């Protein structure tokens, strides 16, 4: 029936994501693992785990990378969900602008190869240059000829998890399940709407350091590892939750409301934004308004809009061959 | 004009390889080599002449045809290095470079191309600069001096060398391609649009429309127009671009 | 309130097992992580998950490996469960695997200092070769003077999972939750008991090959990986499930039945074997007899005991050689 | 996708069953109720629970129950599972046979109406003397020509439930999930199997009394509450715990093995008996052989076969002389 | 380790309450039933369902009620949870004046006898005229000489269930898991709070009707039953959920925030009200402010608090007359 | 209707009632009814004959039509109750009972039994009231007392077949078939053309495992229920299929 397919599994994140999905998928599901190097290892390493009903297939890689790999093309038959997590992990001490090009190229090639067989399947991005990469996927889908404006999502639950963890730490024993987060994803476009949750907030000027932390946490993690990798576990866990939410919504066993980064229509003039939506039996069904906010966060939202405008412009105008 | 018959100015073509456009020169070289497309010289000259004007799809085919019949020539094994490095076949480029080095000025160029293949900058440019000092000529590699630096997020430095390669031969469309994309990477859209329109007009002007100016590689040249559409959003011109007339608004 | 403390949480059987362990503990718990290198790099990634009620603490390991590191000695206070998985070379790049004395030394040097401050904790042995390591651990505990025959556990559940998966793969749709396995944690010295599960069994012709395939798993996984590492995720799953059983048992919330490679206490000539037991509270409570045994597996069990006695003799002789 | 129907929601055997179904049925299901009287009282009391995705439908009945009640039709349309629960339980005097004379007709029409509007739905029986009413239902179904051997079941999980509780209360601490029971659901027809569960067994003398207590539990229950009402809650806990199985077997999320009193179809001499059977998407798919038996089980099975044959004869052969 | 002492479990609601509680309570819990008639029968009927480590205990009164019977005092030792569901049949309650007299006496007698020996447990009143019975319990607890403000709770969670479903019925497909309710538990003296729910709220024209339905939902279920009973199952579900929340808070496995009709230390003018509170290891741990509300609710609060004051005044005036 | 061709079938129906099967007498009454849709006696005798032939569905309609012609007839109302009792049209049975009491469900059955007890008290010696009481106990699933009621009924007027068979039916449902068997024969002695007693005797054979006798008697009942001119029958085909199917389930026993 349902058949999730992760693109890239032998990385520092693909193995953990596959392991996590191998413990919550409904009976009778199926996995499809593809990677250039290391596919046989995960293939005949997760097949020796007892979880009845689930079948684990895989497609091996090929020689040094070549566009339009036949193995992926034949693998991608009969797939319902694609999880794009294949990208360069991290560069030793280089900021994000340099990291853009290789990820853009690889995601363009992967989307072009995958969408040519099963266009109806949903696509979920879990790379890293999110804001400037989702428009690349949109442009590729427009160029090939098929593009559903309600089946494309950029994962942003990680910042919400960080925000709720911090606010729970600062307000024990009070507990809140979710915290809304709006904007883009990269460094400052994130803004949490702490005024929209129940319970009395502690005090002003005490949420400022929280808002700084929920934006500087990624670089803090990178510093803690002394520049030899990124957060390979926390982002490996949220992606599993989001993929399960999408699959469950497709199966019709739940209709969840989730905060994601999707193309806009109607509301805020930016073509893409991280706005609350609701899932259903066929993609997105009802986009929701941001709701009542304060001017203190309204100015932050306007600045985030200004930043994401240029981010999307760069993502759309990358178009780099140079020769 | 479906006809293929063109005059045979091989002398004129080799004379205009630096003092005229690379579009008419390419057409003339194709005409002079279409008679017996099997010798090493015609194929290698065709590949070298298509190196300038961007038609790498047919250029790769011509270079491979030249290579398959002579595993000793030093030029055919060198041209394939850059063109494959740009698009794809990472392993094939390395194997071609090994074969090129296994048949014994351009050593530093090949080294820098190999480094540029696996996303290595700020040092391949150094190797090129130390190479260009020995031979401050042959603007064909001067493009690399900018190109391998222009995608390293340093646009201002890349501009200078570009104009240096412009004066020797104006028909080397790669330099104006690079300056157009560099100008685009400043949010000064007209500065890139003007240059790209000039580039397509020059590469398609003259005798290009005559004699099947509908070459398939030109398709890979038409899409380049629909880059800044996001900031030329006028219904009048967005639909006109799919036919590539360029008569509307005539660049002015 | 439990204070599970993983040791060496930076390897392949490290981060993955730690992630599996994080989102299962009951509300109101506390982890503890330690290793010689990479402790902050994994502690940071776990300080961001949304789950509340569980705290994370870590200690740094000295360099180069020192004896009696005071760091772990300060971390090992108030602990209740230890999961020794540290010290793995994971096929360091040679076709000849010898010098198991390295693993022996690097397990004694830490087990002695762990026991010196937490006498009545409950141990778990995951580092290979369980068969010989376990007697080394017992002798080291005896050397200090505080040893318990009930609170020492060896993890053999991986082969049980393998056997259960392999028997489920051949009879459909009938499903069985588990299949008994006795013997060692090694080559043919391991024997599964197929004559204790409900439903008809397949004929001996395909039973012998299925029993053979269980023995060859390390080779099965390594040959696909071309010598780069071995099976990693499966060991983490087995360790996670076993430590869940143990933690639930120490709270009195469950009294499950497990298959632990533990001492015999006057029931077989061999001092150690994999005999089914029930944990309950206060460590192992009642040891269970193997039960009815088919004649075909009787000689296999005889060979298993004949190999286990030699392995125990080797482990004891090497332990006596050093202080 | 799935729709269940409970026939009788006034007595204690129906209300608790529906209450336990509603809070557990999967998302996007539809629950249908019916009863001669009291249908609005429950259809209004169960529409105020906060479970989303559940739609409650009902149709009250009529005075002096007429044949082919129009309330039943237009209500039992588009229903996937039926549970015949209607029928008055035992009352003082009024011997076993008399109750049968009371119930069969009540079942007969109640099966006749539901058969025409949906000749593809699975059936379940919960009221005593189910040993004899299942042939009555089969005879009613086969008169039309839409009788399916694979979609008729008789719920008898209660006896195995009691035996499991007794044996667990015995070898404590040693938890066992289930214990096999074959035969019917009468006093001297149920044959437990204590020779197939894992672990040791106590002395034979105590085991005789343990077996004896299973067969007559309802007797001391009715002796405890001979005033009014005998046992409704526990039986309810059976049906729900059974029904979900079938429901899941319809969806395709579980293919379990159960011990329902079902048609043997040549697997045994007696036409009907309780055998281990496995449930699939289409219902009955494979019947598991009873396997080995011990000494006393042979005698118990031999007498139970004759008693069950007598019950079937006193059952399926019904005439209703019609004064 | 924990004890739940249900009282009056042989009534209508009590049967379902006990059935729900016993099947899902955690390991090691003791269930002590009690009633005036039929208690032994239901107690025996609750020892045939399979469970692991769940012991069942009970007592029995006499046909004529007796003040301070010794049978109940024999089951009031080592007990922490006192869910009380004792009441009166609806039909012999034609006039509200008589119903108030009979229920108050039994509630005061039961609470007095229960607290005479174990003045450290927690009580959860689930009779009927809550807003009037709870002050009686507070008064008698004060009279016995020992009282604890954060160890006395009243069930008012039902209004939350009623309100939550109705919004889901209108606003689709948006789903919310909770909605606050402030006030008493009379038909009219409640105020739903729909300004604190995320998402686009409907127009006030339908909001007034939705509020009206909640303010009258109690009656139509009685009317459809024609004077028989009063909403039995739904209050059973609500009481079960609230009691299990209390149990898990006491066990220190969760820190819940819930709405319960409790005493106020000064957070609001009314001596008793229903406001969100946070539980813990010692009952109510932290109170919460009501929060911002709109004009129409600001208009409703005056009459709500007025009638609540009238009810509590009536209760305290009835008190001291027969103590 | 084969009797439409006969201008005077009333005497045919009256005379043939005793000499042979009641089936064609019912068809003669049907001819009278279709020719004289106003005579109450023709419809009353048609309904009684259909009750005699063991066809409760058509008897109900015929007696309803008779009741429209005369809402105060005695035999019309009485035969309605037993047919409704067998068809489980309880409310119809109750209104027929109250109509019969006027022509001369816990609460509803209580009212009916109080009415019957009051009527029997003032009329201690009346076979019809005792028959009504026995039929009501048949509705009450209390067949022991109905046995004594019909035993008294067969005592006051021991010269008839119908009530005798009724007694056996009360024994038939109580799994005491052997004794009623001779009573069946006794009824068969009084009237050899009463298909109901053969039906009850076949039920007895089925109860005591007499498969050959049960099958042959079921076939005899089927033959006698077709009227002897089955191609000319009108209402026989409506329900007799089930009777035919009855034999099928009987062969499913053997």
DSSP states of C258-269: EEEEEE-SSSSS
Evaluate the omega torsion of the peptide bond into residue D173 and state whether it is cis, within 30 degrees of 0. Answer: yes
- Containing H/E element for C84? strand C82-84
Instruction: List Cα–Cα distances, E133 to D142, E95, E156, in angstroms.
Output: 59, 17, 12
Sequence ranges of the domains in chain E: 1-155, 156-323
- Taken in order C271, C277, C282, C283, the sign of the CA dihedral is positive
Token pair in block for residue B191: 């500065």
Residue E252 with chain C: CB contacts under 8 Å: 27-28
Query: What 3-state DSSP class applies to D150?
Result: coil
Closest CA to D139 of D257, D271, D15, D50: D271
Closest CA to A163 of A177, A150, A153: A177
Token pair in block for residue A159: 């910042």
* Residue E111 neighbours by CB under 8 Å, 6+ apart: E84, E123, E137, E140, E141
Q: Which chain B residues have any C-beta within 8 angstroms of a chain A C-beta?
A: 82, 85-86, 88-91, 119, 143, 147-148, 150-153, 174, 177-178, 181, 184-185, 187, 227-228, 230
DSSP string, A260-284: EEEE-SSSSSSSEEEEEEEE-SSSE
- The dihedral region occupied by F241, where left means phi > 0, alpha psi between -120 and 50, and beta the remainder, is alpha
Residue D198 with chain C: CB contacts under 8 Å: 196, 291
Residue A173 with chain E: CB contacts under 8 Å: 255, 278, 280, 285-286
Chains C and A touch (3+ CB pairs under 8 A): yes
Q: How far apart are CA C12 and CA E133, in angstroms?
A: 61
Q: How many other C-beta atoms can be found within 10 angstroms of the C-beta atom of residue E171?
A: 18
Q: How far apart are CA C192 and CA C166, in angstroms?
A: 11
Q: Is A71 annotated as a binding residue?
A: no
Facing A97 at nearest CB: one of B143, B153, B174? B153
| Residues preceding chain discontinuities in chain F with C to N over 2.5 Å | 104
Token pair in block for residue A223: 């510093």
Token pair in block for residue B124: 């391949």
Q: Torsion angle of alpha carbons B235, B237, B239, B245, nearest 10°?
A: 170
* Residue D306 neighbours by CB under 8 Å, 6+ apart: none
Go through the domains of chain B in sequence order and give each one's CATH number.
10-242 (1.25.40.10)
Q: How many other C-beta atoms can be found within 10 angstroms of the C-beta atom of residue A223?
A: 12
Query: How close D224 comes to chain F (CA, Å)?
Result: 28
Q: How far apart are CA C112 and CA C109, in angstroms?
A: 6
Q: Is A12 annotated as a binding residue?
A: yes
Q: How far apart are CA D140 and CA D122, in angstroms?
A: 15
Facing A28 at nearest CB: one of D1, D27, D252? D252
Backbone angles phi, psi at A105, to 5 degrees: -60, -45
Instruction: List Cα–Cα distances, F12 to F20, F65, F163, F231, in angstroms.
Output: 11, 22, 25, 20
DSSP string, C5-73: EEESTTSHHHHHHHHHHHTTSPSSEE--EEESS-HHHHHHHHSS-S--SEE--EEEPPSS--SS-HHHH
Which of D48, D58, D185, D268 is flagged as catalytic? D185
The distance of Cα E303 from the centroid of its chain, to the nearest Å, equals: 23
Query: How close D160 comes to chain E (CA, Å)?
Result: 10
Query: How close D38 comes to chain F (CA, Å)?
Result: 14
Q: How far apart are CA D13 and CA D86, in angstroms?
A: 8
DSSP string, D72-123: TTTTSTT-SEEEE--S----SS--HHHHHHHHHHHHHHHHHHHHHH-TT-EE
Cβ–Cβ gap D28/A252 under 8 Å: yes
Q: How far apart are CA D163 and CA C155, in angstroms?
A: 33
The annotation places the binding site of E for NAD(+) at 8-14, 35, 103, 126-128, 235
Residue C176 with chain D: CB contacts under 8 Å: none
Annotate E170-230 with three-state secondary structure. HCCCCCCCCCCEEECCCCCCEEECCCCCCCCCCCHHHHHHHHHHHHHHHHHHHHHHCCCCC
Q: How far apart are CA C238 and CA C243, in angstroms?
A: 9
- Taken in order A312, A314, A315, A317, the sign of the CA dihedral is positive
Backbone angles phi, psi at E98, to 5 degrees: -65, -40
Residue written as token pair 């005497």: F11
Facing C49 at nearest CB: one of A42, A52, A237? A237
Q: How far apart are CA A179 and CA A158, in angstroms?
A: 11
In total, the C-beta contacts within 8 angstroms joining chain A to chain B are 44
Backbone angles phi, psi at D261, to 5 degrees: -75, 100
Token pair in block for residue A43: 């293939």
- Containing H/E element for D162? helix D157-170
Q: How was this structure determined?
A: cryo-EM
Q: Is C103 annotated as a binding residue?
A: yes
Residues B127 and B135: beta-carbon distance below 8 Å:
no
Residue A255 with chain D: CB contacts under 8 Å: 53
Residues B231 and B23: beta-carbon distance below 8 Å:
no
Q: Torsion angle of alpha carbons C100, C102, C105, C110, nearest 10°?
A: -110
C273 strand-pairing partners: C262
- Containing H/E element for E309? helix E295-318
Residues A124 and A244: beta-carbon distance below 8 Å:
no
A57 strand-pairing partners: A32
Instruction: List Cα–Cα distances, B83 to B80, B106, B116, B128, in angstroms.
Output: 5, 15, 12, 17
Angle made by CA atoms A189, A195, A199, in degrees to the nearest 5 = 140
Hey, which bits of C211-254 come out as E strands? none
Helices (H), E116-148: 130-143
Across the beta sheet with C272-278, what order do the strands follow? C257-263, C272-278, C286-287
State the burial class of residue B212 (Cβ atoms within 10 Å of its Cβ: 0-12, 13-18, 19+).
Answer: exposed
HSE-up (13 A, CA, CB side) for residue A214: 30
The distance of Cα B207 from the centroid of its chain, to the nearest Å, equals: 19
* Residue F158 neighbours by CB under 8 Å, 6+ apart: none
CA-nearest residue to B184 within chain A is: A317
Closest CA to F217 of F238, F200, F233: F200
* Pairing mode, strands D181-183 and D190-192: antiparallel
Residue E215 with chain D: CB contacts under 8 Å: none
**D172 given a catalytic annotation:** no
CA-nearest residue to C214 within chain A is: A48
Token pair in block for residue C134: 């376990």
- Taken in order A173, A176, A181, A185, the sign of the CA dihedral is positive
Hey, which bits of chain A come out as E strands? 4-7, 30-34, 55-59, 81-84, 122-125, 153-154, 181-182, 191-192, 257-263, 272-279, 284-287
F249 strand-pairing partners: none
Closest CA to C73 of C111, C45, C124: C111
Evaluate the omega torsion of the peptide bond into residue B160 and state whether it is cis, within 30 degrees of 0. Answer: no
* Residue E53 neighbours by CB under 8 Å, 6+ apart: C255, E27, E28
Tell me how many helices (H) and strands (E) chain A has: 9, 11
Q: Please, which chains are in contact with C (at least 3 CB pairs closer than 8 A)?
A: A, D, E
The annotation places the binding site of E at 8-14, 35, 90, 96, 103, 126-128, 162, 235
SS3 content of chain A, % helix, strand, coil (to 5): 40, 15, 45
Instruction: List Cα–Cα distances, D10 to D6, D35, D128, E217, in angstroms.
Output: 11, 7, 17, 21
Q: Diameter of chain C by CA atoms? A: 58
DSSP string, B15-35: HHHHHS-HHHHHHHHHHHHSS
Residue C257 with chain D: CB contacts under 8 Å: 174-175
CA-nearest residue to E177 within chain D is: D50
Q: How far apart are CA C80 and CA C118, in angstroms?
A: 8
Q: Which chain D residues have any C-beta within 8 angstroms of a chain F C-beta?
A: 63-67, 97-98, 101-102, 139, 143, 317, 319-323
Q: Is D51 annotated as a binding residue?
A: no
Active-site residues of A, by number, are: 185
Q: How far apart are CA A235 and CA A217, in angstroms?
A: 12
- Containing H/E element for D274? strand D272-274
Q: How far apart are CA D4 and CA D30, in angstroms?
A: 7
Q: How far apart are CA C180 and CA A33, in angstroms?
A: 31
Chains B and A touch (3+ CB pairs under 8 A): yes
Instruction: List Cα–Cα distances, F252 to B221, F206, F211, F247, in angstroms.
Output: 85, 12, 10, 8
- Taken in order E299, E302, E304, E307, the sign of the CA dihedral is negative
Residues D250 and D285: beta-carbon distance below 8 Å:
no
* Residue B102 neighbours by CB under 8 Å, 6+ apart: none
Q: How far apart are CA C3 and CA F70, in angstroms?
A: 94
* Residue F142 neighbours by CB under 8 Å, 6+ apart: none
Indicate the length of chain B as a whole number: 252
Q: How many other C-beta atoms can be found within 10 angstroms of the C-beta atom of residue D254?
A: 19
- Containing H/E element for D159? helix D157-170
Hey, which bits of chain B come out as E strands? none
Closest CA to C234 of A56, A60, A5: A56
Among D52, D247, D249, D254, the residue to mutate for chain A (most A Cβ within 10 A)? D254
Residues A238 and A161: beta-carbon distance below 8 Å:
yes
Evaluate the omega torsion of the peptide bond into residue C97 and state whether it is cis, within 30 degrees of 0. Answer: no
Q: How far apart are CA E75 and CA E61, in angstroms?
A: 12
Measured between alpha carbons, how far apart are the two ends of chain D, in Å? 46
Hey, which bits of C186-287 come out as E strands? 190-192, 257-263, 272-278, 286-287
Q: How many other C-beta atoms can be found within 10 angstroms of the C-beta atom of residue C186?
A: 20
Residues F97 and F114: beta-carbon distance below 8 Å:
no
Instruction: List Cα–Cα distances, C269 to C187, C264, C265, C272, C309, in angstroms.
Output: 21, 9, 10, 9, 9
Measured between alpha carbons, how far apart are the two ends of chain E, in Å? 35
* Residue A178 neighbours by CB under 8 Å, 6+ apart: A160, A164
Token pair in block for residue E94: 């034609």
Instruction: List Cα–Cα distances, F92 to B69, C294, D65, F89, in angstroms.
Output: 107, 72, 11, 5
Query: How close A148 comes to chain C (CA, Å)?
Result: 32
The distance of Cα E224 from the centroid of its chain, to the nearest Å, equals: 24
Cβ–Cβ gap F86/D66 under 8 Å: no
Query: How close D130 comes to chain F (CA, Å)?
Result: 20
Q: How far apart are CA B165 and CA B128, in angstroms?
A: 14
Hey, which bits of A228-322 come out as E strands? 257-263, 272-279, 284-287
Residues D105 and F86: beta-carbon distance below 8 Å:
no
Cβ–Cβ gap A200/E288 under 8 Å: yes
CA-nearest residue to C249 within chain E is: E27
DSSP string, chain F: -GGGG-S-HHHHHHHHHHHS-HHHHHHHHHHHHHH-TT-HHHHHHHHHHHHHTT-HHHHHHHHHHHHHH-TT-HHHHHHHHHHHHHHT-HHHHHHHHHHHHHH--HHHHHHHHHHHHHHHHH-SS-HHHHHHHHHHHHHTT-HHHHHHHHHHHHHHS-S-SHHHHHHHHHHHHTT-HHHHHHHHHHHHHH-TT-HHHHHHHHHHHHHTT-HHHHHHHHHHHHHHHTTT-GGG-SSHHHHHHHHHHHHHHHHHH-
Q: How many other C-beta atoms can be found within 10 angstroms of the C-beta atom of residue D70?
A: 12
State the burial class of residue D293 (Cβ atoms within 10 Å of its Cβ: 0-12, 13-18, 19+).
Answer: middle
The distance of Cα D96 from the centroid of its chain, to the nearest Å, equals: 18
Backbone angles phi, psi at B88, to 5 degrees: -175, -170
Measured between alpha carbons, how far apart are the two ends of chain B, in Å? 28
Query: What 3-state DSSP class applies to B134?
Result: helix
Instruction: List Cα–Cα distances, C246 to B45, C255, E214, F15, in angstroms.
Output: 77, 9, 49, 95
Residues D237 and E23: beta-carbon distance below 8 Å:
yes
Q: Which chain A residues have any C-beta within 8 angstroms of a chain D C-beta?
A: 1, 26-28, 252-255
Q: How far apart are CA A230 and CA A4, in angstroms?
A: 25
Question: In this structure, which long-range contacts are made by residues D87-93, counting pairs with CB atoms below 8 Å and at least 24 apart in sequence?
Answer: D87/D8, D87/D127, D88/D11, D89/D11, D89/D13, D89/D127, D89/D128, D89/D230, D89/D232, D90/D128, D90/D222, D90/D230, D92/D226
Token pair in block for residue B48: 């070298």
HSE-up (13 A, CA, CB side) for residue D212: 6
DSSP string, D3-15: EEEEE--SSHHHH
Cβ–Cβ gap E165/D227 under 8 Å: no
D55 strand-pairing partners: D30
State the burial class of residue D235 (Cβ atoms within 10 Å of its Cβ: 0-12, 13-18, 19+).
Answer: buried
């Amino acid at each position: 029936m349902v058949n999730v397919a992760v693109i890239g599994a032998a990385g520092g994140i693909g193995q953990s994501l596959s392991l996590l999905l191998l413990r919550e998928l409904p009976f009778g599901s199926t996995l499809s693992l593809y990677d250039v190097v290391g596919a046989p290892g995960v293939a005949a390493d997760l097949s020796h785990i007892d979880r009845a009903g689930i079948t684990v297939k895989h497609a091996a890689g090929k020689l040094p990378p070549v566009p339009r790999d036949p193995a992926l093309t034949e693998l991608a038959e009969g797939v319902d969900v694609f999880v794009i997590v294949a990208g360069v992990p991290r560069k030793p001490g280089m900021t994000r602008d340099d990291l853009f090009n290789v990820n853009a190229g690889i995601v363009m090639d992967l989307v072009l190869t995958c969408a040519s067989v099963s266009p109806n399947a949903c696509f979920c991005i879990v790379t890293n240059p999110v804001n400037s990469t989702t428009p690349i996927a949109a442009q590729t889908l427009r160029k090939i000829g098929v593009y559903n404006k309600n089946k494309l999502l950029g994962v942003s639950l990680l910042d919400g998890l960080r925000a709720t963890r911090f606010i729970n730490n600062a307000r024990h024993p009070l507990v809140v399940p979710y915290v809304p987060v709006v904007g883009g994803h990269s460094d400052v476009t994130i803004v949490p709407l702490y005024s929209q949750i129940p319970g009395p907030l502690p005090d002003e000027s005490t949420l400022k350091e929280i808002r700084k932390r929920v934006q500087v946490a990624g670089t803090e993690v990178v510093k803690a590892k002394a520049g030899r990798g990124s957060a390979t576990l926390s982002m490996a866990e949220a992606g599993a939750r989001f993929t399960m939410h999408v699959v469950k919504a497709l199966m019709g066993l739940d209709t969840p409301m989730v905060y994601a980064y999707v193309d806009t229509d109607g509301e805020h003039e930016c073509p893409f934004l991280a706005m609350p939506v609701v899932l259903g039996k066929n993609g997105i069904e009802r986009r929701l308004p941001i709701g009542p906010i304060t001017t203190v966060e309204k100015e932050m939202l306007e600045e985030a809009v200004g930043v994401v405008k240029k981010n999307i412009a760069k993502g759309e105008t990358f178009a780099r061959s140079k020769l | 004009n479906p006809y293929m018959y063109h005059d045979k100015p091989m002398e004129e073509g080799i004379a205009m390889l630096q003092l005229a456009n690379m579009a008419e020169a390419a057409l003339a070289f194709e005409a002079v080599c279409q008679k017996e497309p099997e010798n090493v010289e015609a194929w290698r000259r065709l590949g070298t002449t298509q190196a300038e004007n961007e038609k790498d799809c047919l250029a790769i085919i011509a270079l491979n045809h030249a290579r398959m019949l002579d595993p000793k020539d030093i030029a055919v094994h060198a041209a394939l290095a850059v063109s494959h490095t740009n698009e794809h076949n990472v392993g094939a480029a390395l194997q071609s470079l090994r074969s090129w080095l296994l048949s014994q000025p351009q050593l530093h160029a090949s080294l820098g191309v190999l480094h540029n293949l696996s996303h290595r900058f700020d040092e391949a440019a150094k190797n090129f600069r130390r190479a260009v000092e020995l031979r401050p000529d042959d603007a064909h590699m001067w493009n690399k001096l900018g190109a391998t630096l222009a995608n390293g997020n340093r646009p201002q430095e890349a501009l200078e060398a570009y104009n240096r390669a412009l004066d020797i031969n104006p028909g080397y469309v790669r330099v104006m391609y690079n300056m157009a994309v560099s100008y685009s990477n400043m949010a000064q859209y007209p500065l890139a649009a003007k240059h790209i329109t000039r580039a397509i007009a020059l590469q398609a002007g003259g005798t290009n429309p005559q004699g099947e100016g509908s070459r398939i590689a030109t398709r890979g040249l038409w899409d380049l127009l629909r880059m800044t559409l996001n900031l030329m959003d006028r219904s009048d011109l967005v639909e006109a671009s799919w036919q590539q007339d360029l008569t509307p608004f005539l660049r002015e």
